[PDB]
Design an enzyme around this catalytic site. Structure first.
Site, PDB file in Angstrom:
ATOM      1  N   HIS B 350      20.621  48.877  44.173  1.00  0.00           N
ATOM      2  CA  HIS B 350      21.487  48.293  43.299  1.00  0.00           C
ATOM      3  C   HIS B 350      20.717  47.787  41.590  1.00  0.00           C
ATOM      4  O   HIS B 350      21.222  47.280  40.847  1.00  0.00           O
ATOM      5  CB  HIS B 350      22.168  46.958  43.645  1.00  0.00           C
ATOM      6  CG  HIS B 350      23.083  47.159  44.874  1.00  0.00           C
ATOM      7  ND1 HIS B 350      24.579  47.116  44.447  1.00  0.00           N
ATOM      8  CD2 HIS B 350      22.884  47.102  46.238  1.00  0.00           C
ATOM      9  CE1 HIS B 350      25.171  47.469  45.687  1.00  0.00           C
ATOM     10  NE2 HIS B 350      24.114  47.395  46.442  1.00  0.00           N
ATOM     11  N   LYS B 541      29.009  36.394  32.999  1.00  0.00           N
ATOM     12  CA  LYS B 541      28.004  37.327  33.800  1.00  0.00           C
ATOM     13  C   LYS B 541      26.525  36.398  33.967  1.00  0.00           C
ATOM     14  O   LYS B 541      26.333  35.473  33.059  1.00  0.00           O
ATOM     15  CB  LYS B 541      27.253  38.740  33.127  1.00  0.00           C
ATOM     16  CG  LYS B 541      26.794  38.650  31.870  1.00  0.00           C
ATOM     17  CD  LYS B 541      26.765  39.868  31.193  1.00  0.00           C
ATOM     18  CE  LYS B 541      27.953  40.678  30.875  1.00  0.00           C
ATOM     19  NZ  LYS B 541      28.162  41.760  31.411  1.00  0.00           N
ATOM     20  N   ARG B 542      26.013  36.469  34.954  1.00  0.00           N
ATOM     21  CA  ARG B 542      24.803  35.608  35.169  1.00  0.00           C
ATOM     22  C   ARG B 542      23.923  35.723  33.984  1.00  0.00           C
ATOM     23  O   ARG B 542      23.791  36.807  33.252  1.00  0.00           O
ATOM     24  CB  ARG B 542      23.743  36.308  36.334  1.00  0.00           C
ATOM     25  CG  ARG B 542      24.573  35.802  37.737  1.00  0.00           C
ATOM     26  CD  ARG B 542      24.720  34.546  38.005  1.00  0.00           C
ATOM     27  NE  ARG B 542      23.645  33.733  38.245  1.00  0.00           N
ATOM     28  CZ  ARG B 542      22.943  33.533  39.132  1.00  0.00           C
ATOM     29  NH1 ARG B 542      23.662  33.878  40.485  1.00  0.00           N
ATOM     30  NH2 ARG B 542      21.604  32.962  39.442  1.00  0.00           N
ATOM     31  N   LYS B 547      20.733  41.286  30.302  1.00  0.00           N
ATOM     32  CA  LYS B 547      22.198  41.326  29.872  1.00  0.00           C
ATOM     33  C   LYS B 547      22.122  40.894  28.574  1.00  0.00           C
ATOM     34  O   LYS B 547      23.196  41.085  27.992  1.00  0.00           O
ATOM     35  CB  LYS B 547      22.770  40.486  30.904  1.00  0.00           C
ATOM     36  CG  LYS B 547      22.898  40.890  32.235  1.00  0.00           C
ATOM     37  CD  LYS B 547      23.748  39.836  33.171  1.00  0.00           C
ATOM     38  CE  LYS B 547      23.440  40.404  34.691  1.00  0.00           C
ATOM     39  NZ  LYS B 547      24.656  41.435  34.858  1.00  0.00           N
ATOM     40  N   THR B 649      30.326  45.299  37.141  1.00  0.00           N
ATOM     41  CA  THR B 649      31.456  45.449  37.590  1.00  0.00           C
ATOM     42  C   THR B 649      32.580  44.491  36.724  1.00  0.00           C
ATOM     43  O   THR B 649      33.658  44.691  36.764  1.00  0.00           O
ATOM     44  CB  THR B 649      31.888  44.838  39.201  1.00  0.00           C
ATOM     45  OG1 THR B 649      30.760  43.686  39.118  1.00  0.00           O
ATOM     46  CG2 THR B 649      31.152  45.895  40.125  1.00  0.00           C
ATOM     47  N   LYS B 653      36.712  44.917  35.289  1.00  0.00           N
ATOM     48  CA  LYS B 653      37.633  43.799  35.251  1.00  0.00           C
ATOM     49  C   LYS B 653      38.216  43.542  33.905  1.00  0.00           C
ATOM     50  O   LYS B 653      39.692  43.551  33.835  1.00  0.00           O
ATOM     51  CB  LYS B 653      36.989  42.476  35.875  1.00  0.00           C
ATOM     52  CG  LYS B 653      36.396  42.570  37.220  1.00  0.00           C
ATOM     53  CD  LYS B 653      35.413  41.419  37.371  1.00  0.00           C
ATOM     54  CE  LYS B 653      34.554  41.482  38.703  1.00  0.00           C
ATOM     55  NZ  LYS B 653      33.681  40.221  38.933  1.00  0.00           N
TER      56      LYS B 653
HETATM   57  C1  LIG Z   1      18.778  39.577  45.319  1.00  0.00           C
HETATM   58  C2  LIG Z   1      19.617  40.369  44.312  1.00  0.00           C
HETATM   59  C3  LIG Z   1      20.888  40.004  43.977  1.00  0.00           C
HETATM   60  C4  LIG Z   1      21.761  40.415  43.249  1.00  0.00           C
HETATM   61  C5  LIG Z   1      21.229  41.742  42.759  1.00  0.00           C
HETATM   62  C6  LIG Z   1      22.468  42.281  41.879  1.00  0.00           C
HETATM   63  C7  LIG Z   1      21.993  43.865  41.532  1.00  0.00           C
HETATM   64  C8  LIG Z   1      23.631  44.175  40.783  1.00  0.00           C
HETATM   65  O1  LIG Z   1      23.967  42.829  40.569  1.00  0.00           O
HETATM   66  N1  LIG Z   1      23.435  41.840  41.333  1.00  0.00           N
HETATM   67  O2  LIG Z   1      24.576  44.757  41.588  1.00  0.00           O
HETATM   68  C9  LIG Z   1      25.515  45.090  40.936  1.00  0.00           C
HETATM   69  C10 LIG Z   1      26.578  45.718  42.103  1.00  0.00           C
HETATM   70  O3  LIG Z   1      26.191  47.158  42.495  1.00  0.00           O
HETATM   71  C11 LIG Z   1      25.536  46.015  39.957  1.00  0.00           C
HETATM   72  O4  LIG Z   1      26.855  46.094  39.439  1.00  0.00           O
HETATM   73  C12 LIG Z   1      24.807  45.501  38.760  1.00  0.00           C
HETATM   74  O5  LIG Z   1      24.468  46.415  37.753  1.00  0.00           O
HETATM   75  C13 LIG Z   1      23.284  45.167  39.512  1.00  0.00           C
HETATM   76  O6  LIG Z   1      22.607  44.304  38.364  1.00  0.00           O
HETATM   77  C14 LIG Z   1      20.136  42.178  42.923  1.00  0.00           C
HETATM   78  C15 LIG Z   1      19.126  41.653  43.822  1.00  0.00           C
END
Ligand SMILES: Cc1ccc(C2C[C@]3(ON2)O[C@H](CO)[C@@H](O)[C@H](O)[C@H]3O)cc1
Ligand SMILES: Cc1ccc(C2C[C@]3(ON2)O[C@H](CO)[C@@H](O)[C@H](O)[C@H]3O)cc1
EC number: 2.4.1.1
Lengths: 808, 808
Positions: B350, B541-542, B547, B649, B653
């Site tokens: 991810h 978003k976070r 970002k 994502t 939305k």
């Molecule tokens: C500990 C941790 C928690 C969340 C994430 C992520 C990675 C991420 O969002 N949160 O995953 C989404 C789902 O695949 C992607 O759409 C985001 O781009 C990506 O940053 C990574 C590591």
């Protein structure tokens, strides 16, 4: 089984409905099918089904109290020893036969299902169990009564016996949930700790506090077939709403307040966490009380609408807390607030043993509850001004009566606080309440004689007869009907059957049935075999030096030694059963348990003895076990040193259940013997006067050792390692205490005890006459119904009239 | 309201039944009456009523999987960002209109009741929310799928904004209980920690461990109107069964494992507690998997009946855990066990950001999981032997590919472990999966090219269209029917309506309705007024540097400065909304939040600006808020530096909900623009190739500062204290980072961003053409259904065929 009439009717539509709802709960509540469903699932299905029957009455009862607006009774206790709830609910709602039939038709044994339920073991013993019986009786007597306490996550520890020693394990009673309670997070209240006092414009203000939330869980308390369902409210500690991870984990600290019941019921441990628990209950409860009072129709009417009963000194903080609320928050003048407080509060004292008394260090109170300490000091000043006015120049009396104790560590005597802040003070048995006026609180009695009362303890004949001994309940009902169940004095009618052949037969038959069943229980759960043709000699109660399990031990060894000396001489076969938990930090009590098992290790494996004598330690003695062993008992051991057991309640349970009592003239034993006639009790040993005479000249255990060859033999067996061959000196501490430091004079009652026990055996040899004496006991146990006790509290302290009247 | 056809039928008997059961639950479950009942009570009454409708299907579905014996899909994640469950359950069971009517007839507003429910916020953002959408899609596609994770007592913290700063408070989501979950204490399993390895007769043995119990809670996961109800199983930490008081309190330590979600989603924090959480899920889950496999019909068939999907490296311990169970407990030879493991496990990656990668110190693994470390080393040895055989003499490749990283602190690279132990490795968007093969995992790709796949992320059109935007769902259904709801590619039919006057009208009408409602939400809950006639410019978003909320900030200040320079010049009114949580230990992110509020403090109170420009920080951005703000959005900010957002994502939305997108060619933005046509997206800034070219020569922020007067102005405003007059140097760290230490090249995209934003405003001035471009976006959002994503996982990785077939 179903033939038992006291267990109600199995109405065809009722049975059909119960089965339907049982299945409904299995599906929607438990999300199970008959394929994967376990006995535990089936228990829960039944529990939810039965619990549904409480709801209407529970809502209607509380609505009734709102409409009728009676005086409300608030029973504050740090302990509620409730036991199991399933059978009790069925009995009180007349659903037992119906559910038995419903489950049978579903291919299930309801008794097997009942054994799945955990005890709500939120108490240590007699005091906690008294609260539970009281809740039951108050509901049965139609009182607008509210039990208030703490919802411990862990109750009294589960006792394991390993290598002959007690081992403690956490009583995870909420593991599978509690289907009886209703969480009420919406009614959560803040409780304050620490901080400081600001004395300002409006007056004193308690500020900079740390908040712990009190979340109430309400449990229904059904009266006996009167459609009354009262409430027990137990508070659970919750961290307040508002690095990071550690901060979230540290929420555990506040929530620890309600984590575990303190298991020491004989020694005051001035633990801050216990103080927090006590204030936690007090503060949250009194918020409820005040709120309810305001939503009923200015504080002049408070004592007319509120009674606060303090179960010992544990909730004693209610006194300064009520003063704090009335003065600091409601803005009442001190004098008026105090008038209100005293008229509202009453105090029940449960022991004379000095090491049990709560005496909190002032430094601890100053830090945790600074405003309460201030209030306590002011209470003390004004109270001592009253003493000084009543007894001018009596400086020693002032010192003796002061709420403040002056030693190296300055302390607040919580009993003194309770007496000062209560309009009534009661002991728990006639002998106990009398000694309170005579010695313990003599100065307080002389100041305010009208304050001091007796309320002899009682037990509920629902749990302690109809539930645990339906066979005895049935044979009684066959002769005198069912009214006795909530009018226990009707048992006196049974005296007309002392020569009734059928009744003698049936009393004896019921006892034997109970004995077989208990023998079956020990074989099933522990693979322990007991002789069914033996006298069941039972001492069950918490392990304390004052209760003298050690004296029982000496007798058991005496029996063993006598058999070995004369193997050909017939003796009445006995199974000697001793059970009870020791406080984890009570070394001697733990040694006593080990001694009991060690005696068994020798006795139970001696081929010369065989089944003529067996000694067993009943593991994990608790309410549910009491319900099993007491109905099976032949002989009830109530052998506390005269003056040490405030009342006892186990004694009453045995008397109700067809056991004869061997005991001292102590606590309620005295009144039990009075009710039945002393000729029907095995009374032995020093009276209080004799103990005092020994104290006057000095107790010398050596004298008894020097004069009693059989005692000498036993002590030498203990010292030489006869009962611990692999560790000869194992019991040196027990021997040393008995010989040199015995506060409870075990040796002094040894000879009378053994001789009294001989007479027990002599009578048991005559089954007819044993049973006739039993009838004389059962028939006169009526006084010891907690209904009688509660009716007295109601009329003599609370100023409310009890009523057996049924709600619609 | 009820007129909306996609919300189902309000059948007369259904409405009658719902009302009856609503009242039944209010009485028997909640123990309330209409007199004391609160809106919360009414929510719970409805929740229990709706939950009852899941039970039959839930039992039948799981029975069906037992009978049909399909391959089971186990989706392991440390995060499940579920949101609320009430509306979702009603939508998926076609009960929404019926419950709406039932509650209306009872005098209640169902929408008010829905707002009472807490989010199950057991995730941080995109990854956690992806898991939730996946569970939904897997159920809708009839897969025998099981979500497995941890039941955090506290999810993602509730964000408070105080003095313009983020404050964290515990998310006490279980305060009033969770009516959706079913506790399963009967299925509790032991998880082992610490201890040591004994290599003996049968082989290796993990001994002397500390046990933590894993208690499962099962939550129903309804498919869309197919009568399928799958299960999410979340494990809760419980202390094992067997001074005293401290020992009971210390049970908290073990139980802390499941206390709280780690909120840092951008920086690897090698916390032991996190490692325990990860192993906790893995060990308990795999016990379930093995047990279920054995109760289905020797481990050769395991990969035919089991798929384990690893949501990132967080559950990577599943690989050595499965090996451990297979080798040490099941006694399989290493080779066979490894064959089984690889065929069973697949890994989803991810992120490419190096600081996010899990690299556990070997010392930590040795202490906590000694046997797993041993197994990892052996895996590494054999894996590197394969590399050496494939690329003889390539020593650097061996070093690069090793599971063991060799620095001052020796570490295990968990991504490397995952690749080695998985038969499939996928990225989450085409650009991301390609870079994985090209750079990040190039060596692994060259070894096993067949292993590497793409699965572009998706969102569920149930939650993210039908639930959150029923008005848009309805106007779509009016034209093309309801099939699109589980066949989102049917939205392409809407391209036929780009010139349809009625549809243009209705799309615009729905957007305006959503905008009014959101404006009403901010006024109601925060007393914040927003201009309804303004462009809603939303970045939610976070808060992360990558970002680039900071880039948005620069633009906002640009707009402000331009207004001040030319106050008479018309500009399209904007409400700029930025929301999202910062990781508690992420200083820069916390400063960025403060900057957003500080910009607002100036902009929102400048009389020259008035309602022409407003900047608001949306507090406590979470799933439930996303459901409110996204349907109200006009412009979707997706402005990550090219190459940094793996997929995104939130972007999807917004596209589904009628917002136009301003964004970089990053993550799924690329495919979104491809689907819609780039002419319908506001694409700006460096592509990945441009970022790399800058990295090659060195990024010098000073150059952009020196060449762009408007940028220079803003930086000088920030540095001089224009946005913090009471603390002039407040934003020095932000300025220093931007000028000297900006890994994400904010300045490099400033000019293109501002110019792109000008074109956004230009189009918004033309309502017709704005709406036509919106139609072109909505119509081509179909690819981004999580149904499509899951169908791909099923066919390309799991080897199962999805089915929309309805169960009886
Ligand atoms: C500990 C941790 C928690 C969340 C994430 C992520 C990675 C991420 O969002 N949160 O995953 C989404 C789902 O695949 C992607 O759409 C985001 O781009 C990506 O940053 C990574 C590591
Ligand atoms: C902390 C604590 C706990 C229990 C007790 C008691 C006192 C006692 O049993 N437990 O109360 C019973 C109920 O009144 C009496 O029957 C017992 O004699 C008395 O010892 C005292 C103090």
């Amino acid at each position: 089984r179903k033939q038992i009439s006291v267990r109600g009717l199995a109405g065809v539509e009722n049975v059909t409905e119960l089965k339907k709802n049982f299945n409904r709960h299995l599906h929607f509540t438990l999300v199970k099918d008959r394929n994967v469903a376990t006995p535990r699932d089936y228990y829960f299905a039944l529990a939810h089904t039965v619990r549904d029957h409480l709801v209407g009455r529970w809502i209607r009862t509380q609505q009734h109290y709102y409409e009728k607006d009676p005086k409300r009774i608030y029973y504050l206790s740090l302990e509620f020893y409730m036991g199991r709830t399933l059978q009790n609910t069925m009995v009180n709602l007349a659903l037992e036969n119906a559910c038995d039939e419903a489950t049978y038709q579903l291919g299930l044994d309801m008794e097997e299902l009942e054994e799945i339920e955990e005890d709500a073991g939120l108490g240590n013993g007699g005091l906690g169990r008294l609260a539970a019986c009281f809740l039951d009786s108050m509901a049965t007597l139609g009182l607008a009564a509210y039990g208030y306490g703490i919802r411990y996550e862990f109750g009294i520890f589960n006792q394991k016996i390993c290598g002959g020693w007690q081992m403690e394990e956490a009583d995870d009673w909420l593991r599978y949930g509690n289907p009886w309670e209703k969480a009420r997070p919406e009614f959560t209240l803040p409780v304050h700790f620490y901080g400081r006092v600001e004395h300002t414009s409006q007056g004193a203000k308690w500020v900079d506090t740390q908040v712990v939330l009190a979340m109430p869980y309400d449990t229904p308390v059904p009266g006996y077939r009167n459609n009354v369902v009262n409430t027990m409210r137990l508070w659970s500690a919750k961290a307040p709403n508002d690095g990071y991870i550690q901060a979230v984990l540290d929420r555990n600290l506040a929530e620890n307040i309600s984590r575990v019941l303190y298991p020491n019921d004989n020694f005051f441990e001035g633990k801050e966490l216990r103080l927090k628990q006590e204030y936690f209950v007090v503060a949250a409860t009194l918020q409820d009380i005040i709120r309810r009072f305001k939503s009923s129709k200015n504080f002049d009417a408070f004592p007319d609408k509120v009674a606060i009963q303090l179960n010992d000194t544990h909730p004693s903080l209610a006194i300064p807390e009520l003063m704090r609320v009335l003065v600091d928050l409601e803005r009442l003048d001190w004098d008026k607030a105090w008038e209100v407080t005293v008229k509202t509060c009453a105090y029940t004292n449960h022991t004379v043993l000095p090491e049990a008394l709560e005496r909190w260090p002032v430094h601890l109170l100053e830090t945790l509850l600074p405003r309460h300490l201030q209030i306590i000091y002011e209470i003390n000043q004004r109270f001592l001004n009253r003493v000084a006015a009543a007894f001018p120049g009596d400086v020693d009396r002032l010192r003796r009566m002061s709420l403040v104790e002056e030693g190296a560590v300055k302390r607040i005597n919580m009993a003194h606080l309770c007496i000062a802040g209560s309009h009534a003070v009661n002991g728990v048995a006639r002998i106990h309440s009398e000694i309170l006026k005579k010695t313990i609180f003599k100065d307080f009695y002389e100041l305010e004689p009208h304050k001091f009362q007796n309320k002899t303890n009682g037990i509920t004949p629902r749990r302690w007869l109809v539930l645990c001994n339906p066979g005895l309940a049935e044979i009684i009902a066959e002769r005198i009907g069912e009214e006795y169940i909530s009018d226990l004095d009707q048992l006196r009618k049974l005296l007309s059957y002392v020569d009734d052949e059928a009744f003698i037969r049936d009393v004896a038959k019921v006892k034997q049935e109970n004995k077989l069943k208990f023998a079956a229980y020990l074989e099933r759960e522990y693979k322990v075999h007991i002789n069914p043709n033996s006298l069941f000699d039972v001492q069950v109660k918490r392990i304390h030096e004052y209760k003298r399990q050690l004296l029982n031990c000496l007798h058991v060894i005496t029996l063993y030694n006598r058999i070995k000396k004369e193997p050909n001489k017939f003796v009445v076969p006995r199974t000697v059963m001793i059970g009870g938990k020791a406080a984890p930090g009570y070394h001697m009590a733990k040694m006593i348990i080990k001694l009991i098992t060690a005696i068994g290790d020798v006795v139970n494996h001696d081929p010369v003895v065989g089944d003529r004598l067996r000694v067993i330690f009943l593991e994990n003695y608790r309410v549910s076990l009491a319900e099993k062993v007491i109905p099976a008992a032949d002989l009830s051991e109530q052998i506390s040193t005269a003056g040490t057991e405030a009342s006892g309640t186990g004694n009453m349970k045995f008397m109700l259940n067809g056991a004869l009592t061997i005991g001292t003239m102590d606590g309620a034993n005295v009144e039990m013997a009075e009710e039945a006639g002393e000729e029907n009790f095995f009374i032995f040993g020093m009276r209080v006067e004799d103990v005092d005479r020994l104290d006057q000249r000095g107790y010398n255990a050596q004298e008894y050792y020097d004069r009693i060859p059989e005692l000498r033999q036993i002590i030498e067996q203990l010292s030489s390692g006869f009962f611990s061959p692999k560790q000869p000196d194992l019991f040196k501490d027990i021997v040393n205490m008995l010989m040199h430091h015995d506060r409870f004079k075990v040796f002094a009652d040894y000879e009378e005890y053994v001789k009294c026990q001989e007479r027990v055996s002599a009578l048991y040899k005559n089954p007819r006459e044993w049973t006739r004496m039993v009838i004389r006991n059962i028939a006169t146990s009526g006084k010891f119904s907690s209904d009688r006790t509660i009716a007295q509290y109601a009329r003599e302290i609370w100023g409310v009239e009890p009523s057996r009247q049924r709600l619609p």
